[PDB]
Amino acid sequence: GDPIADMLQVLPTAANTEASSDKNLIETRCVLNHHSTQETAIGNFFSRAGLVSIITMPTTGTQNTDGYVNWDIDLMGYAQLRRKCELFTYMRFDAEFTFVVAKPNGELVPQLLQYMYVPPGAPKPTSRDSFAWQTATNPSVFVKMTDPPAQVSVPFMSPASAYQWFYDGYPTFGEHLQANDLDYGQCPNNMMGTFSIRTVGTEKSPHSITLRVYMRIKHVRAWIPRPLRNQPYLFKTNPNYKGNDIKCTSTSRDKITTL
Amino acid sequence: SDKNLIETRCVLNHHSTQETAIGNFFSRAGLVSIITMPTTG
Amino acid sequence: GDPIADMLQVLPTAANTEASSDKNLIETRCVLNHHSTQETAIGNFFSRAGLVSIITMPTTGTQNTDGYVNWDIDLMGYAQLRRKCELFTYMRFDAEFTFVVAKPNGELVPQLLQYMYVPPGAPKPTSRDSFAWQTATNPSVFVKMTDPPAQVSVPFMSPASAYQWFYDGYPTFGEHLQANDLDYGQCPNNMMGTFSIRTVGTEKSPHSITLRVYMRIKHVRAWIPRPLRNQPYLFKTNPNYKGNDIKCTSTSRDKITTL
Numbered sequence: 001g002d003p004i005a006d007m008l009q010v011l012p013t014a015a016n017t018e019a020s021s022d023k024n025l026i027e028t029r030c031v032l033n034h035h036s037t038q039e040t041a042i043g044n045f046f047s048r049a050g051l052v053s054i055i056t057m058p059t060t061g062t063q064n065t066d067g068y069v070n071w072d073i074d075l076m077g078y079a080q081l082r083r084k085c086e087l088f089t090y091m092r093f094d095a096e097f098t099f100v101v102a103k104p105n106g107e108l109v110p111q112l113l114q115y116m117y118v119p120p121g122a123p124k125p126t127s128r129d130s131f132a133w134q135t136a137t138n139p140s141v142f143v144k145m146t147d148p149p150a151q152v153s154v155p156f157m158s159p160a161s162a163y164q165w166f167y168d169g170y171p172t173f174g175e176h177l178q179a180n181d182l183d184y185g186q187c188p189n190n191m192m193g194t195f196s197i198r199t200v201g202t203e204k205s206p207h208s209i210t211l212r213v214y215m216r217i218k219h220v221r222a223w224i225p226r227p228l229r230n231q232p233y234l235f236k237t238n239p240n241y242k243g244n245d246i247k248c249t250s251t252s253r254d255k256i257t258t259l
Numbered sequence: 260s261d262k263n264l265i266e267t268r269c270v271l272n273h274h275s276t277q278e279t280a281i282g283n284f285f286s287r288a289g290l291v292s293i294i295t296m297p298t299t300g
Numbered sequence: 301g302d303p304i305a306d307m308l309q310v311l312p313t314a315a316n317t318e319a320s321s322d323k324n325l326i327e328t329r330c331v332l333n334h335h336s337t338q339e340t341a342i343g344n345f346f347s348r349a350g351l352v353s354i355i356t357m358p359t360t361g362t363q364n365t366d367g368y369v370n371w372d373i374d375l376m377g378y379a380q381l382r383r384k385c386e387l388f389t390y391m392r393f394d395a396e397f398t399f400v401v402a403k404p405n406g407e408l409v410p411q412l413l414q415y416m417y418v419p420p421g422a423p424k425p426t427s428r429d430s431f432a433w434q435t436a437t438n439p440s441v442f443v444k445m446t447d448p449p450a451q452v453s454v455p456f457m458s459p460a461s462a463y464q465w466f467y468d469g470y471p472t473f474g475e476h477l478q479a480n481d482l483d484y485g486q487c488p489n490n491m492m493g494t495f496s497i498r499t500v501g502t503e504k505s506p507h508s509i510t511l512r513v514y515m516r517i518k519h520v521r522a523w524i525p526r527p528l529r530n531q532p533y534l535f536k537t538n539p540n541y542k543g544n545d546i547k548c549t550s551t552s553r554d555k556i557t558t559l
């Protein structure tokens with residue numbers, strides 16, 4: 001008939017000890033161990049809001065003095081949350097963003113603000129009065145600095161199945177000449193666009209404004225553990241480290257025989 | 260029609276069409292008026 | 301269960317004619333036609349012995365004057381059998397070889413002869429007395445010129461499934477420089493070795509000897525008909541033709557309107 005023949009790892013509580021791997025090298029007693037493992041579930045480890053951005057709109061100075069700012073969404077500028085995330089290679093999750101806004105010294109004034117999510121390809125505001133603030137399709141939040149911090153849920157938005165903290169490659173084909181090495185490690189699947197903020201008015205606001213953005217990871221999944229960062233972070237988009245001062249992971253001592 | 264002009268594999272495609280329902284396309288608040296009542300002018 | 305879904309043409313007698321393709325364009329009668337098709341069966345067409353070699357061992361002259369001859373078996377030197385065979389691309393068959401031997405004028409004398417089949421790789425006789433005539437493994441026939449013609453059956457011996465009259469290629473890899481174009485069309489699967497003949501004696505025979513070899517194809521199979529040779533043959537191993545005198549396949553006449 002056929003012409004060709006060739007054609008869960010961690011349970012809810014800690015393991016008990018039975019009376020005589022401890023009970024393998026030493027004599028043991030029985031211990032009814034009911035210590036929980038829930039707090040080390042990745043969800044509890046990650047679902048804690050952490051700082052991911054500090055945006056300023058001063059009234060004086062040489063930057064963002066026009067009452068609006070387009071902040072390219074890049075969550076790798078703060079060491080604490082970054083190191084936790086980088087314990088894994090890939091992570092998938094929804095996120096809760098909270099916007100804590102105040103003047104530079106922490107005082108609050110009755111000032112109306114608008115935060116708009118500008119996905120990749122949507123036109124960015126070019127002034128406090130730009131037509132883009134009409135926000136007929138993009139999601140916007142109007143809130144006062146005297147209101148409690150604004151807060152919204154952002155779903156998992158990557159074109160890929162998970163965000164990836166490490167992408168060993170280039171975004172496109174071509175020669176990869178020295179002049180473009182900045183391309184290395186750049187994963188467009190993590191590029192979520194712009195976050196735009198403005199004081200709501202055609203006239204300039206007399207208040208300097210500082211916005212602290214916190215992100216809380218939720219409904220998280222993680223894949224492929226990796227060694228934890230042991231050198232200070234230098235740049236947002238690469239793992240460069242200071243070659244002249246390579247830190248040892250552990251503190252030192254004089255002799256291997258004395259504490 | 261791919262599987263008509265080229266040889267295809269089976270793809271169990273579960274991509275949702277909900278976000279393009281006109282309700283989701285339109286039910287987003289947008290600016291329709293700016294009214295001013297200045298004290299001078 | 302499966303992760304990937306994508307993974308006889310001519311009868312014994314001539315057709316009859318039925319009373320009304322003749323009976324399609326003209327009115328016909330019934331003809332009970334019992335004309336046989338047997339004589340055109342390839343076996344009857346081919347199983348007729350034909351000349352394939354004429355070997356001479358003169359006593360005087362400048363060739364084969366030592367009472368022995370090593371004849372490289374190449375059956376394409378005689379036009380009649382060659383053209384019939386070349387009607388096909390591949391042919392498989394056994395063969396009956398008959399050896400008609402006499403002096404140059406047809407007279408017969410009491411002379412003992414030996415014919416030995418020397419397959420490719422067997423040592424060839426280098427004299428009338430060579431050790432190879434011991435013929436301890438090769439097949440030999442000892443016969444007198446006064447006996448009836450010697451005759452033997454040779455089986456189908458090619459390493460391939462059929463002999464091939466046309467091989468569009470080269471026997472080996474390599475550059476194929478102009479100096480070696482003789483290689484083109486050479487099929488080793490048809491190369492059956494050597495046919496060796498000698499007068500049986502350490503002393504020279506006073507008789508000039510002419511051997512005519514006839515081959516009768518039998519138990520034949522043939523594949524892929526091709527246009528029949530329409531130019532005189534020039535060489536044994538290629539279809540070269542005389543370019544300055546290309547023969548028309550049909551005779552000519554003065555006008556297309558008169559016979």
Ligand SMILES: CCCCCCCCCCCCCCCCCC(=O)O
Pocket residue numbers: 073074075076095097115116117139140141152154157163190191192195
């Ligand atoms: C209406 C106001 C809401 C706007 C909130 C800002 C939304 C920003 C997009 C959220 C993307 C979260 C995934 C981040 C993946 C990390 C990318 C990176 O920094 O390399």
Ligand SMILES: CCCCCCCCCCCCCCCCCC(=O)O
Pocket residue numbers: 373374375376395397415416417439440441452454457463490491492495
């Ligand atoms: C004992 C004496 C018997 C020797 C008889 C000669 C045998 C020659 C070998 C027969 C081979 C027949 C196949 C020929 C195929 C055609 C090859 C060619 O000429 O291109």
Ligand SMILES: [Cl-]
Pocket residue numbers: 133134290
């Ligand atoms: Cl507006």
Ligand SMILES: [Cl-]
Pocket residue numbers: 433434
């Ligand atoms: Cl001998």
Ligand SMILES: [K+]
Pocket residue numbers: 013014015016033034
């Ligand atoms: K237990």
Ligand SMILES: [K+]
Pocket residue numbers: 313314315316333334
């Ligand atoms: K018939």
